[PDB]
Design a protein around this ligand. Sequence first.
Ligand SMILES: *[C@@H]1O[C@H](CO)[C@@H](O[C@@H]2O[C@H](CO)[C@@H](O[C@H]3O[C@H](CO)[C@@H](O)[C@H](O)[C@@H]3O)[C@H](O)[C@H]2NC(C)=O)[C@H](O)[C@H]1NC(C)=O
Ligand SMILES: *[C@@H]1O[C@H](CO[C@@H]2O[C@@H](C)[C@@H](O)[C@@H](O)[C@@H]2O)[C@@H](O[C@@H]2O[C@H](CO)[C@@H](O)[C@H](O)[C@H]2NC(C)=O)[C@H](O)[C@H]1NC(C)=O
Ligand SMILES: *[C@@H]1O[C@H](CO)[C@@H](O[C@@H]2O[C@H](CO)[C@@H](O)[C@H](O)[C@H]2NC(C)=O)[C@H](O)[C@H]1NC(C)=O
Ligand SMILES: *[C@@H]1O[C@H](CO)[C@@H](O[C@@H]2O[C@H](CO)[C@@H](O)[C@H](O)[C@H]2NC(C)=O)[C@H](O)[C@H]1NC(C)=O
Ligand SMILES: *[C@@H]1O[C@H](CO)[C@@H](O[C@@H]2O[C@H](CO)[C@@H](O)[C@H](O)[C@H]2NC(C)=O)[C@H](O)[C@H]1NC(C)=O
Ligand SMILES: *[C@@H]1O[C@H](CO)[C@@H](O)[C@H](O)[C@H]1NC(C)=O
Ligand SMILES: *[C@@H]1O[C@H](CO)[C@@H](O)[C@H](O)[C@H]1NC(C)=O
Ligand SMILES: *[C@@H]1O[C@H](CO)[C@@H](O)[C@H](O)[C@H]1NC(C)=O
Ligand SMILES: *[C@@H]1O[C@H](CO)[C@@H](O)[C@H](O)[C@H]1NC(C)=O
Lengths: 182, 48, 48, 340, 194, 48
Amino acid sequence: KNKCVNFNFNGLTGTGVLTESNKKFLPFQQFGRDIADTTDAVRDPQTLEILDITPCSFGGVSVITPGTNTSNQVAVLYQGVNCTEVPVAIHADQLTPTWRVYSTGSNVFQTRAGCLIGAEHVNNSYECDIPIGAGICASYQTSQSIIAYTMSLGAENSVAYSNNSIAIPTNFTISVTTEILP
Amino acid sequence: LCFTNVYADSFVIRGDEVRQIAPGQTGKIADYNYKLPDDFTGCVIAWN
Amino acid sequence: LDPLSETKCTLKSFTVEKGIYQTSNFRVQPTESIVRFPNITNLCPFGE
Amino acid sequence: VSMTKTSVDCTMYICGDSTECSNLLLQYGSFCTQLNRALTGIAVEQDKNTQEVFAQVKQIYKTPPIKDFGGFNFSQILPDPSKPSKRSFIEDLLFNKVTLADAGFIKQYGDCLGDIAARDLICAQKFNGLTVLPPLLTDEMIAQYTSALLAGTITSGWTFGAGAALQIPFAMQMAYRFNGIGVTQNVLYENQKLIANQFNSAIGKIQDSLSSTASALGKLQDVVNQNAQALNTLVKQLSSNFGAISSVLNDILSRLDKVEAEVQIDRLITGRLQSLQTYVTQQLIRAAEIRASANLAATKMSECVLGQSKRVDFCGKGYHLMSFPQSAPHGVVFLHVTYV
Amino acid sequence: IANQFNSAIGKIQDSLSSTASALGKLQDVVNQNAQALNTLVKQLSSNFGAISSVLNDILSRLDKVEAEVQIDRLITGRLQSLQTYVTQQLIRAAEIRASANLAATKMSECVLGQSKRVDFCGKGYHLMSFPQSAPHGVVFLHVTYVPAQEKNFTTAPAICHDGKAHFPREGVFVSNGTDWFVTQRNFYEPQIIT
Amino acid sequence: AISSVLNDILSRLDKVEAEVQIDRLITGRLQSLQTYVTQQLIRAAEIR
Ligand SMILES: *[C@@H]1O[C@H](CO)[C@@H](O[C@@H]2O[C@H](CO)[C@@H](O[C@H]3O[C@H](CO)[C@@H](O)[C@H](O)[C@@H]3O)[C@H](O)[C@H]2NC(C)=O)[C@H](O)[C@H]1NC(C)=O
Ligand SMILES: *[C@@H]1O[C@H](CO[C@@H]2O[C@@H](C)[C@@H](O)[C@@H](O)[C@@H]2O)[C@@H](O[C@@H]2O[C@H](CO)[C@@H](O)[C@H](O)[C@H]2NC(C)=O)[C@H](O)[C@H]1NC(C)=O
Ligand SMILES: *[C@@H]1O[C@H](CO)[C@@H](O[C@@H]2O[C@H](CO)[C@@H](O)[C@H](O)[C@H]2NC(C)=O)[C@H](O)[C@H]1NC(C)=O
Ligand SMILES: *[C@@H]1O[C@H](CO)[C@@H](O[C@@H]2O[C@H](CO)[C@@H](O)[C@H](O)[C@H]2NC(C)=O)[C@H](O)[C@H]1NC(C)=O
Ligand SMILES: *[C@@H]1O[C@H](CO)[C@@H](O[C@@H]2O[C@H](CO)[C@@H](O)[C@H](O)[C@H]2NC(C)=O)[C@H](O)[C@H]1NC(C)=O
Ligand SMILES: *[C@@H]1O[C@H](CO)[C@@H](O)[C@H](O)[C@H]1NC(C)=O
Ligand SMILES: *[C@@H]1O[C@H](CO)[C@@H](O)[C@H](O)[C@H]1NC(C)=O
Ligand SMILES: *[C@@H]1O[C@H](CO)[C@@H](O)[C@H](O)[C@H]1NC(C)=O
Ligand SMILES: *[C@@H]1O[C@H](CO)[C@@H](O)[C@H](O)[C@H]1NC(C)=O
């Protein structure tokens, strides 16, 4: 249980993590299925207890970079995955990415989007440069390295309101801006 | 593999009618005495 | 080779611009197989 | 303003855990990349649509702690400091009235593996490769941009929409408004108490309405519904035979050789591919529906929140005075204030 | 005002002389239509379950009975590859058709007139805009009055001189700390309350 | 398909052959409707 394996039951060849289910199968039941019509529980046939099936832990991979013109350092997002599992994604089993050089860790960070590696969490907030998600962004900066940060929305400012006070412009600028529509 | 029910059907024919034993066929064997279903799950085993 | 090398290979460019980019999803492969079936001991009546 | 971001493991959807199927799926070329890219073009423009509606102010205006607004009572629509998100009382009404199936809110497998692998649509979507993604802005950051737009408005009127904020006493400001719809400014100050009583009463009617009924936010709920309905249908599209022996891939592959399986499997590769080629089209068109809604909302922000509109019925039914933006799940809600 | 204007237009030249960064909106449309043509072309490399990606390699090898079982695979593959491209091109044409209707609206309201619409002709109070062309698009040089240096003033919503209330016909009342004045809402020029 | 007529196919062959031919009619049409409906969905967006 809890490990990733090529299970078969009765010729139901799948792949997953087996787990002790809390399902009260009625005595005639041997299978349970997903809303999707795929098996997701099954009674063990030699030793009558009920197993949950989960397809083995996995997710999308995405890469963060300042551009080749400036650096060959990149940071990597494991979208939808707590950092502990990433060690569990050791090359002692054959991951779909064969590159596993980032499972060294040391700068490992958890986010709402997943677990982020090769980038450093800096408490200081900046303008969003590369959007990671959920208010986190990343950038390459100072001895350059990739930093990750919660973004700053803009300067905080308390306006000078009072029940009897007014600001008036004594001077102006005549700005010009571009605006480009296809 | 595993199987939920199994049956064997045992009979004799001429060799020139073995082609009629496969599913969805025609000919007097396949029309008047032994028909398989259109989805037939199983295997056909014949010898002189 | 490395995450940059997958991204170059993916964009089919030898030079990658500033951004965030998608790459082949990861999934732990099974360590080994598990087989499980009911234990029966007699063999089926093939001689009959 | 937005809809749920999504991405599909195109290979795992069509060919989940098989090398044999991947080596068939390869024979079509770029189809899965074109699908993946298209979902990405949608997902990336959701961060655009969110940005363009809400991130219109580059300076985060905070309210004074005192409230000397001359009898107008924004307490239900300003930030309430007591709450863990700095959202207003009416926003905490709006945030309850919409049901959502996830939003990216950390799936970490301590829940979604084992028991909650079964009784959850979204974990099955996540097991067929159908990854929802979190938006770039958290609802606190939307609440802050909204707070800044609202705090800027109640303290400075239209002046922050042109440049630096210029403070003005509210009652007086409303005088400039009234003067913009041509009811001369004295008519406000001669009735300020009656006006404040009606403005507060009209906010009281917004509350009493949107609290009581279980239906009101239909125009947002139908988006959140159509996203999930299309993914739940795309999940059902995996259950079909398409004329093949079984709608499970490994129950073909265990039962057949290298050639009879190629005849079967390509049926699923066809049917399934046509199921993503449908779904991604349906999203690219809906995305054009929500884009138009978002660009329109970014104009309703620019013209009803950053200013007073002389455009009849654009800022709700009546002569416009001013409007207040409110964050919502995937949406903006304007509260228009009008002279009638 | 003219020296600020000639300097602002100077900054537009000096800025767009340095970089491509601003033109990403045109450059992306070009990139995307080029990409889709590369994608439509590159599909011809694909087997689509046929023995070959190449049509002549089917015909130069099979009889009519078999060739049709190869050729209809090619037809099916390529057909769907056109349909996808044509779908993408129609939906992307809708993104551009909106971009054109908006550009025609910005032309009518910010070029042929002065719009009171906030932020439609850009951040600040619109004066006028000049169109410039671009490859497959339009560019607008929007000129805006922006209030830039402010001072604090004390104010009253009305004044009393003989028990009657007084209000500005136009403008607002202010005090410099010592004397009251009336002034125009968007620029400090004080005048005697007459 | 050997005919665009659904019952000519049903007359000339058998069910297995229908899986070869009637199936073509199933596919090609279902592509036809998806084509019309897509054109109508895009078109509908212009009319909105
Ligand atoms: C508020 O603004 C007022 C207008 O600028 C200003 O008052 C003006 O002050 C000047 C001197 O600084 C006076 O100038 C006259 O001074 C004497 C008066 O006898 C004459 O001999 C001179 O020839 C000259 O005419 C203005 O007459 C006076 N005007 C008014 C209406 O007061 C205030 O000082 C300003 N206050 C602050 C706090 O800045
Ligand atoms: C406009 O005035 C406010 C506050 O009123 C002034 O306070 C004194 C400094 C003095 O000028 C009085 O005669 C005025 O009535 C200014 O607000 C202060 O801003 C600074 C930062 O610049 C901040 O550290 C202080 O805590 C603020 N003080 C208060 C009381 O709010 C404001 O800066 C003035 N702005 C302009 C444009 O003149
Ligand atoms: C991954 O991290 C999450 C925290 O984000 C862990 O979840 C916590 O688990 C403990 C024990 O079950 C609970 O008491 C906490 O309330 C949980 N908090 C949250 C936010 O989940 C989770 O256990 C971690 N998983 C692994 C495998 O380490
Ligand atoms: C209003 O602001 C302008 C600048 O935007 C001021 O003009 C500048 O004045 C300084 C001297 O004070 C000169 O050195 C600059 O050359 C001027 N700029 C230009 C473009 O000519 C102007 O003096 C300010 N006026 C007020 C009333 O404050
Ligand atoms: C603004 O209106 C709110 C209610 O709409 C007022 O807050 C209420 O104050 C009373 C009296 O103490 C309490 O009984 C209520 O429970 C409060 N309601 C809430 C939601 O806080 C507020 O006092 C009004 N402001 C002014 C200046 O009168
Ligand atoms: C399988 O064999 C074991 C002993 O080898 C026994 O405990 C068990 O009962 C057998 N299975 C069944 C279904 O009886
Ligand atoms: C990138 O290279 C270009 C030349 O191709 C150069 O003009 C630019 O300054 C470079 N930028 C950086 C950050 O290296
Ligand atoms: C960031 O700030 C927190 C306090 O909010 C502190 O505990 C933490 O050590 C800081 N991180 C670093 C790297 O200094
Ligand atoms: C401003 O409000 C305070 C109460 O907060 C009041 O005491 C004061 O008299 C008011 N002043 C004006 C000019 O309205």
